[PDB]
Amino acid sequence: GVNLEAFSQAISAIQALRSSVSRVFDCLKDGMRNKETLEGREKAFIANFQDNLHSVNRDLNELERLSNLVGKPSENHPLHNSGLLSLDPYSQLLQAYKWSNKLQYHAGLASGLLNQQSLKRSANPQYVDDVISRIDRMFPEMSIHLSRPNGTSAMLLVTLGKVLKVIVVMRSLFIDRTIVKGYNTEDGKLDIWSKSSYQVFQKVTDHATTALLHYQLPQMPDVVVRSFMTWLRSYIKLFQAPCQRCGKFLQDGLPPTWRDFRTLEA
Template identity: 75%
Template structure:
């Protein structure tokens, strides 16, 4: 309440101060006006100069007077109250016609929103910086200069090397059968058969896993023309779900410096699906996809949602 009264007094001083500013501006502009017009035509040069100088002095004095007046008024206006956290914009809350112009509440919303945004951005950046090995962090953290250096060395691996890595991984897991195809150029496409449970088609770019599709053991993996069908989704809901999980997994396992480790981790993860159908319905607790991010390599994917 005291604040409101204080403001009421100030408002009077404000209007005086504003008229003071107007007076100052007009006297200043008068000075420049007379300077622009120059000396008026008189009979003698002396008379001309005399009149011009006296007029100029008079105008400068009036400017000085106005300026002093303004300084005096500005002392009355006083400093804006520091007590309000939003400074002068806080005075908007005193607006009596709040219903018509909800400016103050909108302003508060905007402040809250921007504070929250800043807070979340801070959290996200600290989280991303912890996972320096993951793809997303790599794109953000590593400088633009480094990326092109890493990529070519791992992208242009000789096909022979890829074959070796894949066959070594195939020997590691007896229940995984990995067949390697090169339908277009040097990029490999793997057909991974896991026991009698599922078939996964893994599209590679050098040793990077680009895409994966999981289908049932009894589903077709070839087109009519005998080529591997890398696009069609599985007709069963279970395997559509598994495909989603596998895609998440391959985004999760990223290690550009050692791509063979990534492929091995992915296969270890995929292998845990051998018990897909053996779990009972109720034990398979449906967990959201985000939980998969915390499943380390080699653990059972016990988060299946089979129905």
Template identity: 45%
Template sequence: MPTRRFNMLGLRLSRFAEAGTRSKASALASDLEKTGASIGSVQLFSNIDNLSLDPVDKNTVMHSQLLQSYKWTNKMHELASQAVSILNQNTLKRTQVPRFSSSKKQKVNTLAACTISPALVDQLVAQLDQTYTDLSISIQRPLGNCGVMQIELGRTLRALVVLRGLMIEWVKVKGFDETFKTEDGQIDIWSASRYQVFQKVTDNAEAASLRFFHPLMPQLAIKSFIMWLQAYKNLFSAPCSKCGKYLQNNMPPTWRDYRSLEPIHDVCQM
């Protein structure tokens, strides 16, 4: 008799547990149905979003990379639009771009620096040659009215500057043991130096020509550029003004500050 009672009690408990489990399961199912109805369907904005649903890990990474590229492209477009609006406000331009209307052609205004006579240019070059004793400056005109100014700085470097009037159009810098002559004796304005250090100085000189450019005072621009170039007389003997070292990455200080003319390594000015 006791065994039978225990069996009946166990049967009742199991039925009660099953009933409780079923009620909990039904309650959970109803909650899930309510939650699913509130969420609704997943909205895909483009076909690229289908990659995020792919269970393959490789495609999932591709989706995030595409989204990052899309954001980067939009950011670049926004920055470019802002740059255009800022540059349009700048009135100091090296080249006057002609603007034409549909009914009448407007006259192009030429920069004053480009209309200076060759005699005045030669006079300024002769004055600079007398002012800077450690520089040897001469000018030739093998290309017509455009002057080619050749500069020798001690036994350090040679520079070639192409002038259109008093506006610097082209700059090349080579070592003292190199030449700007071709095999047939013509002036070579295109070939670069075979030394990496003077290639870097050429890049810095081109940047300096843009930095010192002034459309209203072209003579001051030329004088400032020559003064800046003269600071390279200690190219291989002066340490960097920031790190105090003579070499960084096997290169001397190839940059000269625009204001103080102090030698600085390219990596030190960043």
């Protein structure tokens, strides 16, 4: 429901229109303080009209208009007002909603800025792994599956849009030893280790290994595998290469910083 942001923007716009009206009528209530060469400050008056032209910005709200026109009479809210009149203590529900949203955003910002850790070091479960894999499989166009043909370690494969499927061996976490193979795969009777490529997919595997060694966290493997899955899914397009042309080399793929760009650019 991003229309709330649009309505807040419209409120800010109309408040700015009122403020600009007040400001221009106040400026008209004063003359040239000290010009001594030309009363060019009257041009600021015209500039004030530009702020009044910002009223047309409120007309932009007509594009954001038609945000809500439905039934759903306030979404299951009325309990005491439209219900038991004696049930007056209702608003506690809305208070709790606001409290929870505030706590959520507060803790989110706190965790986001707490990246500057201060802990030096630490000095003085296959079912869980399969469950984490299945939970990560919950994203669209990211059909993954595992079989564990050899060993107690995890053998996971991912196929997003093309025949560029990737295999990643895990040890219940921090899945290292990545191998991407475009257009064949599981030869013999299980996953293979051919690692054949077109001198570019091998580079992609190198990038994946670099990320795995880079996105390795000291604990909490959930966030680790989540960042891993997002980093891999970011390859769904492979069609744009900023900071250079589209043919800087054999192929231009390296989104390590949440944005794809031309390869060989570190």
